Amino acid sequence: TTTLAFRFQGGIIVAVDSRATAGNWVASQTVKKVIEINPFLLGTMAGGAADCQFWETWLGSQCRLHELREKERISVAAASKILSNLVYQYKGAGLSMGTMICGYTRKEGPTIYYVDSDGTRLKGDIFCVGSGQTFAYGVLDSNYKWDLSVEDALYLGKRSILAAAHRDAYSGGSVNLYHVTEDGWIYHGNHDVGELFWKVKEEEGSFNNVIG
Amino acid sequence: MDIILGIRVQDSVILASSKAVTRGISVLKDSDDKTRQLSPHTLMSFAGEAGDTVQFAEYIQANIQLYSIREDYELSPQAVSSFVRQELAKSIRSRRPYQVNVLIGGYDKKKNKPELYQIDYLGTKVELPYGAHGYSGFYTFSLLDHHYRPDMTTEEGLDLLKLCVQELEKRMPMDFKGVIVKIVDKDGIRQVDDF
Amino acid sequence: MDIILGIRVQDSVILASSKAVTRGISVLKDSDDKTRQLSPHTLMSFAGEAGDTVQFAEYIQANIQLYSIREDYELSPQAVSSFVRQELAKSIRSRRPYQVNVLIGGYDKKKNKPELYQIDYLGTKVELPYGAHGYSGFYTFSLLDHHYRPDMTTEEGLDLLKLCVQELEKRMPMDFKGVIVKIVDKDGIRQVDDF
Amino acid sequence: QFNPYGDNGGTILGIAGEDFAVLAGDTRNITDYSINSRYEPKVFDCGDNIVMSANGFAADGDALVKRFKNSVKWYHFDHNDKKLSINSAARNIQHLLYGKRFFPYYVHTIIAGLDEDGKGAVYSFDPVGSYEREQCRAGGAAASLIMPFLDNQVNFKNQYEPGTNGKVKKPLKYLSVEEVIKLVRDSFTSATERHIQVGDGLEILIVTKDGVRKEFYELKRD
Amino acid sequence: RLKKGEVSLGASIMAVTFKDGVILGADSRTTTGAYIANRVTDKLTRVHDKIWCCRSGSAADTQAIADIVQYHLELYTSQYGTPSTETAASVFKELCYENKDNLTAGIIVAGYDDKNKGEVYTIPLGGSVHKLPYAIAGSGSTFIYGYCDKNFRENMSKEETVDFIKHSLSQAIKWDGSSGGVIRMVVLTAAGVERLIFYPDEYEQL
Amino acid sequence: RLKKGEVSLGASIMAVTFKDGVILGADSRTTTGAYIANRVTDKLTRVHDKIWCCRSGSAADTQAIADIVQYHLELYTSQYGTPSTETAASVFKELCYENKDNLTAGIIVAGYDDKNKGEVYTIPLGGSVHKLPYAIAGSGSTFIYGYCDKNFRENMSKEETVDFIKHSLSQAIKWDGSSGGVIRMVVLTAAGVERLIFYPDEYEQL
Amino acid sequence: SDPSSINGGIVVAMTGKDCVAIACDLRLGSQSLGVSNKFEKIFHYGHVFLGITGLATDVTTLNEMFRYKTNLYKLKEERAIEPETFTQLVSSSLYERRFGPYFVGPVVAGINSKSGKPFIAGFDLIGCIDEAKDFIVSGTASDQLFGMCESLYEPNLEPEDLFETISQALLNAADRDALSGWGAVVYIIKKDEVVKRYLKMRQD
Amino acid sequence: TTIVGVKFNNGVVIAADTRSTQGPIVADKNCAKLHRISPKIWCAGAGTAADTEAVTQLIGSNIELHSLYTSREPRVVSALQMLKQHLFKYQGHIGAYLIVAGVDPTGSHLFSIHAHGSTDVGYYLSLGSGSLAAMAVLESHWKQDLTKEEAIKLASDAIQAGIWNDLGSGSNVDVCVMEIGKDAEYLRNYLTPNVREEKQKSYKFPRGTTAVLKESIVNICD
Amino acid sequence: TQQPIVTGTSVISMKYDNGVIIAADNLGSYGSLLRFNGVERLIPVGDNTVVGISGDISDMQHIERLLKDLVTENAYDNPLADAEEALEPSYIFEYLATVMYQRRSKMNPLWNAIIVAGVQSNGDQFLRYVNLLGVTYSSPTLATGFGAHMANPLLRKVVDRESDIPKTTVQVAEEAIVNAMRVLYYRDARSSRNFSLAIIDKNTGLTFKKNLQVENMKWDFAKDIKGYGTQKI
């Protein structure tokens, strides 16, 4: 896996790859690593596939039960803490999860929480999670500004996953883009690295290490 | 020993190497030069196991200098890199192998081209536009994939290198006390004193 | 989690705690506050195993806050420290112990005295003029042995603390991204924003 | 020390068409270098136009299929004989598998059928419950041999339009039941040649709106 | 399978059916390693009037088992009358089988009914039950498999059976360091219960 | 001691001196775990005209040793004439003792001199030498210590010694899974060298 | 710490009608980190082609070693070495290091200049020869390559058709292996002409 | 592997399957396990494939030099002795399991050698992973005084038992007949009962399907 | 977690036109020691099923007791216990298969390999295998332990597929089974000469044969074999 999400002027960008591996065997190139919890909440998935998928769909059920009981959408903080408290109960049992709970509410504004399987829970503006997190960080950090436009922010997120997809052997397939605003999340398409790499190489002039 | 980087541009090769020497919970030195001049137009940086690194570098340096005196001629970077690779390829099947990783930056005067070679302790050689050893690569490679262009100048290369060091200083766990930068071109080897 | 320090002076207790949160070869965050307010005049910093640290701190915080509501009264730092020690002393013989080390800095309003308690994950409590957890102590204790005086002011304590952080930034292997400093005195708890 | 797991070999394969779906699997059962049976079926009709196979450790595979078949039965009792949709079955199976997260069923599960729009559907599972709908999936011992061939022939991967300078991709289209069975038979004969645990016989289960049909073909017995 | 440093009952034990009933036989030695902890042990023990057993393996385990079996058969007698030898063996098995991981007890059960005459059941480490004409067990029994198979006959007399046991255990003792001391025997017949003993000076020079 | 997966020579071997000389005896079973790799093996092997040996332990080790000993004794004969049986045993010992770490070879040496008549030397795993009236060895020998000690007599006849070996190995085979097949024998006397064989149908029903 | 899967890579070879093809990927990595996308694994000595997968230091070492040996061969024999003979030389050299072996999976390919017969062969790390009429595979995606070749291959393919078959075999196999890919090269070899084509593949 | 050796009236016959494995993967579907040590001394090999080839060639080379030195046709016992002493010296690490057979001036012979250097004599022998399947057939159908045609039938039947029942063995049956007074006849692919069936579909791609980045002519000439 | 102590070796079986045959030797091994010789390892259930068991004997005796108790329990409140509602082979197998898998799942297995042979009420042949892992499979021929390696090859030459079952008579089928038992005695180091054999026919019913012996053995060629290579004497 490579997954990222960063906060900026125009809300939150969330970008993920779609590869799944079993050792060196590429098992899938079309995995959905973003879970759509509700129109205002997203969750990213890295680590054990079953662990992430099972518990984040479970998280969605707990969020639904909150708004039925409280007649109000759950906060990003509360949603992330449900997941972090859950994995903490299983600490030492061998769960493998690197997740990011991203969303918007009125009281909080745009918010991102990093939550992992050893119980760590951190609020923050920028996070990259997965085997190719460092490759994404390299591109993202060196090009990040708070004042990025929605168009530029979407591209930087896409370009950061592409960078990791290229270098990290255990990342690839395609890029899934999301944009989170005050009005909720908006899907910005599936982008196959097969066509995207060459399109980016030609137009941007980058990737000069590769034989053109 | 930890961070060594290398970038080949249009007319030169630039090597950056961390200054910190750490043993246990103490930084013993913060001004260490992790490189040796093999010949006037060839420079080798190194990183790995304590003691092995310097012992290996100086041993190579002595051999290349011996060749230069014998033939009154400077070996090409390609020739030096091949010699270095073979020494490491011997080493890996010895009783006690050299645990040293190197970058060899040189300027070929016959071809009038800069050349950067990355060689690991196993004797694995590759020619590259940009290279790194250790955990550094996990950040710098993707960064350079994006920002690097083949026709860049030496000044553009130094800015590109500053971008790498900044990223490393932000996301690396250990304090590596900055880097010593050196440039290899048609006029030989020189050190950037203010980085 | 790594560096947490504490200095008791004439009229206050000063706690300094590193901002870095590192996982693997990546610094995930550089603005982390490794402390919780247990009561208006009691502050606890913490360091240790990931997840355990915050889970333990907040659990203690909830219990002390529950006491405050029930009795409409603030527990003394000595009483809070004893409660915390017992929880860790239970923990160490559990199925899965809390691997958390803490410093408790408080101001006793009845005695009009500042108090600093150092408690490790085993439940080992000591009252001290200055304290540290982890590798930090190997530098700071000897430094404070020399420069510390019991009748110092809060400002003198902050300068003494700057001297510790500088030494750590010079000789520690890891980049801990500076510290968040907080002061505990007769007027409660406040944070120094520029350090 | 007692080892509760074993490897019974074999391999399985699921392909989805426009209005149909197939789930194939060889009939050979093995332990180490011995053949246990030349005909031991591991692809099962579970009712509600759902076919299922759980390949790997056969004892776990049988236990799982048995529990899912039972899950279908109780779904009818508890919800007024409602048809269990393929998507609902998939989610139910995830919970069966993840229920034993800390003592897993050592199997690769594949189910096939029709979705609620009448279109062909194939779902695949890992041992602990992670699942995904796909047009194509091979599982088991020879999955690594068959799967890339399916990427090339079913999803037309790495195939471009001739003369277009590698710019226009070969367009995706559904395959006929005749063309799919050709690919299944070729996949298994190829796997039989190069994998020792694969052979003896091939059993295919085809699923259309009309029901569940079967076809059987001989495979090399060496 | 023995616990470290626990007393070892390694033995030369045997039970032999014959015309008038059954005879149990055993050596007298206990070891911890190479040191003989007890040289005069009684390894033939009563669980009921005419149902006895030979003990081998762990001293502690076999004693604890035999004490429980004696309790069960005493309670059986109070409700249902005298138990069969098969019944006694079943109670031994149940304990040995269900606790096979925590126990080291190689027990031979031997008893005399009026209907069923002399019977012998052997129970090895696993907890399995085997009904036999005669049985041998203990560390020293290996050395006398050949001898006992060649020399055993069905429907022997009392004096012949006593000689068969004496000669057999004599050899087992001679070759097994874990066996030695006196040779104890117990005779089970319709007549009653008779105890016999044989000393080194006699049996060594056989 | 056996190397993983190597053929095991586990056996029922014995050599017995008697009035006219000495007789060697052995089973024919060779095993790789519980599979019988050879059911008709010859474990009695010639190192000199009237000096033979019985092999047990590792098939490879015993063969390599026996081949070297045969070489030494052939070279001894060319220079110094016929070697004594003691001399042959000494050469076996020297190889077994000096390479005790790398070898698994339980060898019985048996030969016939005119002066010294029949002699038997046994050489266990350690490499020690023991001169005896008779000797037994191999996995299956454990089961016939009792039988052989009770039934052996000095100065037996040829027919008595053949019966003694046949009955003994029959029992060893019956109880040892690592022993089986035919019973081979070799007779060493002043008359010469005679080979004998005995099949299951005969010896099983003894 | 498994020498054969540290760097990654694959090689495949096929025969056709009066021709042979040999192809390889371009990746060199250090476990998860992709380092080089220019690392070719196919070399040639005269008209004999050798592909080598496995530990990269040994790939380089063996290329240099066989260049050394074939050069001396040519000087003494006064002719180019043939594929059948070279195959034996490779086997000898690898078995010489029986108990301290080069961690490689070599593949020979070429046309015998005298008879004109197409020839391919493969080896394990200690020199065992694997000859084949149809195809030889090697590398971290060998399972994948075996599956592709066994289904796609047919005998007596023309050079132009054979190119398509071997290329599709390599590409789809590489895309199912994490340590293989990052580019590819295909050699088409006729009696007296040799074409070398670089393939466009996904770069992840 | 499965390999066998059977003695008959006027000589000896050996046989072998032709499967070569790499874990569970079939590396070579038609490899030659029968090796020529000298013209009339042949060797069937099982175990580590490189070791059986290397050890058979080395001894074969030394046998040739010995034959030239002594001006005599080589003997089977010489090959036997040289092989066992070599294998013993390497304490099993050279994993060669051989059935050595042949005719010489002394007569016809049949032996087996194991990796640790132990040898056995017999009228019928079998080695390899399918030796149990083969030996079952040999034990059931072998008799004294076999003819040439009967021994070939028995030997091939024993290999077939390995081919069908052992996953380690497969494909074809190689045979070598060594009769006294005649040349030894090597019968490569004596039986071929595992022919691949016609594929359902041709996977010949349209020309231009593969995307290409660069072309270049390679220089093979001087 | 167990380790088997007293053990039983191969159980072999096959189908023929009108029914099934099953066999197993009478040995109870204690490691390399062939300790017990009167051990019956075929256990009939009713007049239409035979359960053959290999592996640990203490666990075998436990399984005996369960089957014995199953017959008793089936008879309770069942007027058709000796007719329509009698125990079928399929019922007996599924029960055992359930137990074996439950025990492996509790990490405390019954250390056995079991073959349930019988004939159903409708005349159909039943033959299915189950072991300590709960693994189950069916085939025209089935065997455990060595039997799997040596017997199956021989029995498959008679019945290689389903269509060969009607073509195989009880005479031909029994001959193959008896031959297989001889081969196992030649080659299995933990086997005995004495064995039991059972036939369950749809017409003639259950025939249980005890105290059989392996015979017509070839040992004569042994006398010609001398040394291990060179040796002539």
Ligand SMILES: *[C@@](C)(CO)[C@](*)(O)[C@H](CC(C)C)NC(=O)[C@H](Cc1ccccc1)NC(=O)[C@H](CC(C)C)NC(=O)[C@H](CCc1ccccc1)NC(=O)CN1CCOCC1
């Ligand atoms: C990047 C892509 C790689 O790390 C991401 O991290 C992704 C995250 C997405 C998928 C949510 N992670 C994975 O792909 C993840 C990596 C991984 C694997 C194993 C443990 C932890 C992390 N992959 C998986 O979870 C795979 C997904 C399969 C291919 C769909 N699953 C497995 O490997 C399974 C089950 C793993 C498992 C976990 C915990 C307990 C038990 C099992 N394992 C197998 O399938 C084993 N094997 C596969 C090959 O054939 C034989 C059976």
Ligand SMILES: *[C@@](C)(CO)[C@](*)(O)[C@H](CC(C)C)NC(=O)[C@H](Cc1ccccc1)NC(=O)[C@H](CC(C)C)NC(=O)[C@H](CCc1ccccc1)NC(=O)CN1CCOCC1
């Ligand atoms: C039957 C079919 C199986 O026993 C026969 O016995 C045949 C014998 C004939 C072919 C000579 N045996 C094999 O085919 C034999 C089986 C085997 C495998 C592994 C170890 C021992 C025996 N196969 C081989 O020897 C193959 C030959 C290949 C197909 C050319 N070799 C390998 O599998 C090598 C083993 C190398 C080895 C090293 C050290 C000790 C012993 C053997 N393995 C690999 O190449 C696997 N791997 C691939 C990636 O690179 C690293 C090695």
Ligand SMILES: [Cl-]
């Ligand atoms: Cl006692």
Ligand SMILES: [Cl-]
């Ligand atoms: Cl031998």
Ligand SMILES: [Mg+2]
């Ligand atoms: Mg086979």
Ligand SMILES: [Mg+2]
């Ligand atoms: Mg004694």
Ligand SMILES: [Mg+2]
């Ligand atoms: Mg990648």
